[PDB]
């Protein structure tokens, strides 16, 4: 089915310590394939998925050089955003920006995005067209004029619709055995009493991949959470009138199940 | 692979 490639950058000022922290992570679908952390021995972009390890030295210099650019940028950004917001150098601030591209089953282009935050709040975003920006407030509106002057959207659109799709495809190909696999949810139910007369049914979806899952009852739904090995766990649960367990059923829709599972008790 | 168009705010 569909596919994503997505990068996330986070930069966090830390007054009286030193150039701020910058974390860069890159995902293909639900699997991390790269990493960069400014505070680390390497000072290189580092692999975190098996398949990506087959790109030669020139790919790792390339990505190292680009990722550093991005940190340096976000440094300048903290501080520019301070100027705009009249805040002093004594407070800790964050700057965040994610971007990436979607593709379908045929692997054609779907959507692109690029989004930027300051201290957890929306700051400026590409529109879905890829040609125009939504600005949140008046400082973001300085940025926008800046990025219009500089034809940033033209650039981002060439990337989002271009390089982005072409590199994802390549990843999808050199890593088919791990990225095109689909691990179907190991399914079961538990039952627990409470002060009467009611019982808790708990519908489990375990070690599935990708993470998109849907758990439905005829009401708690924890958020899908990683198991740590590359697969995902989730559960859903209803409190139901004791003795009436056969009236209820749990439907598990997932990309790895030829047909929707349905659970009894 | 990373991209262009990252510019200072």
């Amino acid at each position: 089915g569909s596919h994503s490639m997505r990068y996330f950058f986070t930069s966090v000022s830390r007054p009286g310590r030193g150039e701020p922290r910058f974390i860069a992570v890159g995902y293909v679908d639900d699997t991390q394939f790269v990493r960069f952390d400014s505070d680390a021995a390497s000072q290189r972009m580092e692999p975190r998925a098996p398949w990506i390890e087959q790109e030669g030295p020139e790919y790792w210099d390339g990505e190292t050089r680009k990722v550093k650019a991005h940190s340096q940028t976000h440094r300048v950004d903290l501080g520019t955003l301070r100027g705009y917001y009249n805040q002093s150098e004594a407070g800790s601030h964050t700057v965040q920006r994610m971007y990436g591209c979607d593709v379908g089953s045929d692997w054609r282009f779907l959507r692109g995005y690029h989004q930027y935050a300051y201290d957890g709040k929306d700051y400026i975003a590409l529109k879905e067209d890829l040609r125009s920006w939504t600005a949140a407030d008046m400082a973001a509106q300085t940025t926008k004029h800046k990025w219009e002057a500089a034809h940033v959207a033209e650039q981002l659109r060439a990337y989002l619709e271009g390089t982005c799709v072409e590199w994802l495809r390549r990843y999808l190909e050199n890593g088919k055995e791990t990225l095109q696999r689909t691990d179907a949810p190991k399914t079961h139910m538990t039952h627990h009493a409470v002060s009467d007369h009611e019982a808790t049914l708990r519908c489990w979806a375990l070690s599935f991949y990708p993470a998109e899952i849907t758990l439905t009852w005829q009401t708690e739904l924890v958020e899908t959470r990683p198991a740590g090995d590359g697969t995902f766990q989730k559960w859903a649960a209803v409190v139901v009138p004791s003795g009436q367990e056969q009236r209820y059923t749990c439907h598990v829709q997932h990309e790895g199940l030829p047909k929707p599972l349905t659970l009894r008790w | 692979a990373l991209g262009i168009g990252i510019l200072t705010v």
Partner: T-cell receptor, first 112, second 110 residues
Framework: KVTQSSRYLVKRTGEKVFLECVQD?????MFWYRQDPGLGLRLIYF???????EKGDIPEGYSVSREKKERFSLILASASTDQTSMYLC????????????FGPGTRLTVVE | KEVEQNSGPLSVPEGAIASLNCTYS??????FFWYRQYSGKSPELIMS????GDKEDGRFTAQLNKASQYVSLLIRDAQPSDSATYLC???????????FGKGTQVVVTP
């Protein structure tokens, strides 16, 4: 846009020469070039932020100074006759795949 | 890893099309620039290109082909004002240096 402090210059060998370059485009990067018939632009020095500097393609004979974001000084420490050339300042925003803009050039000639 | 362009002076009849071309050694590259430089003036940015295909801006047509590491600029009506050196430029990825071509001169003759 971008200004350089001078447009033509005539200097004796051994004279130390100051070329200045001023940008009001909030640009963080600044670059000094030579241009010479047959070679093309050669980068002497650049600067990605204040008080920083890195040698370019040909840094021999030259020193730079970047105390200010809008100002990137090139100094010819002892002028030789092979320093006769067109000198171009350039600047750009920091980032990925950004474009530079040039100053008007300075034409400097060095005689014995 | 240099940038290379065809040799000057290329001679072009007024009304005809001037073909400026450019090849680059680094396949990872992502920004491409055309500079116009008249006699004893500084280079002027006249065209930027980023995606595979054609980009049009008045009488200028640029095309980028990444598969081949190949960049083109066409100047459609070759007018007199159009004689200058056209420079090819690629993003050097390193602290925003550019690698420049050596220049192609164009003489548009009346």
């Amino acid at each position: 846009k971008v200004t350089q402090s001078s447009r033509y210059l005539v200097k004796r060998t051994g004279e130390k020469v100051f070329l200045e370059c001023v940008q009001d485009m909030d640009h963080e990067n600044m670059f000094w070039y030579r241009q010479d018939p047959g070679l093309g632009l050669r980068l002497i020095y650049f600067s990605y932020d204040v008080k920083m500097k890195e040698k370019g393609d040909i840094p021999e004979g030259y020193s730079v100074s970047r105390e200010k974001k809008e100002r990137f000084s090139l100094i010819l420490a002892s002028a030789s006759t092979d320093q006769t050339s067109m000198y171009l300042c350039a600047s750009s925003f920091l980032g990925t795949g950004v474009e530079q803009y040039f100053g008007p050039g300075t034409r400097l000639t060095v005689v014995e | 890893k240099e940038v290379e362009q065809n040799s000057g002076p290329l001679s072009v009849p007024e009304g005809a099309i001037a073909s400026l071309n450019c090849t680059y050694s680094d396949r990872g590259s992502q920004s491409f620039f055309w500079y116009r430089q008249y006699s004893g003036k500084s280079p002027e940015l006249i065209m930027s290109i980023y995606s595979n295909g054609d980009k049009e801006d008045g009488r200028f047509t640029a095309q980028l082909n990444k598969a081949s590491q190949y960049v083109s600029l066409l100047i459609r009506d070759a007018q007199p004002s159009d004689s200058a050196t056209y420079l090819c430029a690629v993003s050097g990825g390193g602290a925003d240096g550019l690698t420049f071509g050596k220049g192609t001169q164009v003489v548009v003759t009346p």
